[model samples]
Target: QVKLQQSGAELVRSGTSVKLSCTASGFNIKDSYMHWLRQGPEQGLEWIGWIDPENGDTEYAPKFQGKATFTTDTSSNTAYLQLSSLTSEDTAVYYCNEGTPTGPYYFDYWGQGTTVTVSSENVLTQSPAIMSASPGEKVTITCSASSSVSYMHWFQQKPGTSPKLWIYSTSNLASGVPARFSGSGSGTSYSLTISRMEAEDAATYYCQQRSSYPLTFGAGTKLELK
Candidate 1:
């Protein structure tokens, strides 16, 4: 019954800055943390960082350290992610997610992602490519849960293709993932491992779970041709 409503779309020019917000309803905002993620063009999900609304403590993925800031206002039940020194690389859909009792490592709820387009003085191009693969063949992917569900699901998506389910409930295979690919971990610590790497496995992969409510995801990992 919990819901996360996010602000509108954004169109910003290079070198500028933008602030986005996510307002929570039907939930106690102060008890959980807020997470930020980005999907560029056709690329996979990218973790920006998270903010603890109660304490205002924040953590950023190394990649987002200098480019993004996360903050929250417990009084308003709203969370914010500000992107500074914007570049074309920052253009994509930004999502706001809520963490559960399991803490910052798991997201049980999510906002309806907001899309942002960063143009160069008026120029734009096609979306970026996102890719992932099975086990034994170097593939990158992410896993996310809804509330604080111990289990999560992983997925694979290729350019112009629909997302294919990969891992499930955290570490279980989704029926078709090769045996060479295995998932491990629990609680806040989880991961997917590929044993030998492959060619057709080039695609983007993501993790998801319905353990709680608002489904959450990990920053996607890209699988490229080596």
Candidate 2:
């Protein structure tokens, strides 16, 4: 079994930096992508991005650009998130997360979460914050978080295909897809269910929250059939 042990809570003054850590075991950390996520008080989750310990590659949310840094140490099998120039708005519970290249959306595992509180609170924020199916099979995809800023969005992407938005915020279907595909959620949980399954559905699906800035996404679930 794989488990993540996150660092302790923190109380930092404004304009400073904090480095959060997550140590992994029972899995090949070298073969995984480690990510950083955070939630503001009473706010929805935001993805800070990720670091591939095996190759040092990275990805970040446009909102988190320059505000956060992702890194990892293969020697210790640990992941790190360093947030800079803190403010009360930056206070939130952060988690160290994991994903795979084949499917990196809907996180399969998570750290316990490290709470970081900055001086002087309140900025509309940190409360802090899976699936499988096969060809011609029935399955449901779910996205969970501490909260959502305003709405949730879903996307579809295969290894070599450009990502296409299927469902946008709540239940509004995107440019393509059947009307049967719908999204519903409130508070910390939501789901995107496909009434019927087809072989063409054999791709990666990701749930994204657009209610807040620094938008974030679920690690995504793979549609692998039996």
Candidate 3:
């Protein structure tokens, strides 16, 4: 019954700052780990960092070392994120989740996510936004970026759940992803394929690029069982 109630959407100008809040209910924030993650349009999830509310300790992703800050209030059981020097690159949906400090490296309890928009321009194209396939058949989703990208990654999101990383660096599968899922292509063209799709594979898949600032994502493709 644990729940994370995040703040509402934000609209800030470049070079400015914004503060987001996540209130914990049905559980004590001081006894668990609070983590922050973000996703652009259809982009893959980016781990911003995590904080231990009990001791006020924090660990942030190297990419956000100084740009992102985490703070907590045990009295009211709310976690806050202050993002500074915002720009188009900072536009994304941010979520707070509860997890253990140990391993697993995946979170189960997630907030509804607060959308932050610091940009006014974005574009990424995905083909066959909706497709149908049998459980035993194979299917591929294609993505095209406006410009060349350093790397392309893929993600899958089940109904009423947060997005999960499935592939990284264009061809590397995430730790827990199935071998049946694969990624390919270079530059502006990329594709994700699933061989012998399973019934559980029915979900929305998205592709993202990281070569430029303000990373963008494809429109997303939803796979349906026939």
Candidate 4:
């Protein structure tokens, strides 16, 4: 029964600042972890950071160093984000998500979103590739990311189907996935290989990193038989 109602969109000038708010309800703000994220039209999700209403402790993605601030109010169960020294790169839709302690490093609830556009330009991604291999042949899909690979994951999304997790948390295969698929790597480069590529595996494969909030995905690679 949790809800996060965020503030409206904003258009700020470069070098200026904007303060956005997310008011929470149906839960104890003191016991929750409130996170802020930004998604650019051309780029993947970016983790700004989180605010602990219980203690005020905060952590941010290295990329956002000094560019964003997280604050909250316990009395009214509200969270705030102050983005400063804005630039074209800061143009994106901002969101505040309440962390769910249960599982899968993801937000339990998210606010509607506040769109921000900054002039003086504005910002974003990765290019996965295509593979040509015959059935029973070995094939590999590599991944590159901006963050750590220790939290990396992989997914399989056939063109006509919804996605499904293939590899999780770097190298752990998800339940019921084929034993032919395997994952490995470090830092910014990782790989997912299929011992014997099957025709059904001709779909798109993606690498994702969740070691941080506002998880990001690598461009999917489509493998074809030829």
By summed lDDT, the worst window of 10 consecutive residues in model 2 runs over 121-130
Q: Model 3: C-alpha RMSD to truth?
A: 7.5
Candidate with better TM-score, 2 vs 3 = 3
The C-alpha RMSD in Å for every predicted model, in order, reads: 10.0, 12.4, 7.5, 6.8
Report lDDT (Cα) of residue 135, candidate 2.
58
Candidate 3 lDDT over 134-203, as tens digits, reads 8999999999888877678777888767777688788888767999999999888899999898999999
The runs of at least 3 residues in candidate 3 whose Cα sits more than 4 Å from the true structure, single-residue gaps closed, are: 103-107, 119-132, 136-156, 159-161, 164-200, 205-226
* Model 4 worst lDDT run, 10 consecutive residues: 121-130
All candidates' lDDT scores? 0.68, 0.70, 0.81, 0.74
Measured by TM-score, the strongest candidate is 3
User: Model 1, range 132-156, lDDT digits (tens) per residue?
Assistant: 4444555434343323455656667
Model 4, 10-72: lDDT tens digits are 988899999999998887767768878776765345668787889998888667868889888
Order by TM-score, highest first: 3, 4, 1, 2
TM-score of 2: 0.56
Candidate that beats the other on TM-score, 2 or 4, i.e. the better one: 4
**Model 2, span 27-136: residue lDDT tens:** 66677678687755643456787788888888787878899898888788888889999999999889876644352233346677899999960022111112455555
